[PDB]
Design a protein around this ligand. Structure first.
Ligand SMILES: [Zn+2]
Ligand SMILES: [Zn+2]
Ligand SMILES: [Zn+2]
Ligand SMILES: [Zn+2]
Lengths: 48, 47
């Protein structure tokens, strides 16, 4: 969604929260999955 | 012409081009690595 409405990652300030970590049960960002703390996790797109 | 903006992924329109596929040697987006055609590749942040 639009900037100003879409929550941004605390770790990656320029990345929208755009995925869901199924392993951790938290929404998070794709950079956290590629390079960060959710690298080992099962994740899914939030969508849209 | 306009001032700068951040290039966005063709496949993932809401995603910034924010990584570099070291394998394919091309800039791409993190969603292409997570779920897309670069899932198999080694990548790094443009940062
Ligand atoms: Zn993140
Ligand atoms: Zn996780
Ligand atoms: Zn992409
Ligand atoms: Zn690649």
């Amino acid at each position: 969604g639009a900037m100003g409405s879409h929550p941004m990652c605390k770790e990656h300030e320029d990345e929208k929260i755009n995925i869901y970590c199924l392993t951790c049960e938290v929404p998070t960002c794709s950079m956290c999955k590629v390079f960060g703390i959710h690298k080992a996790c099962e994740v899914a797109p939030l969508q849209s």
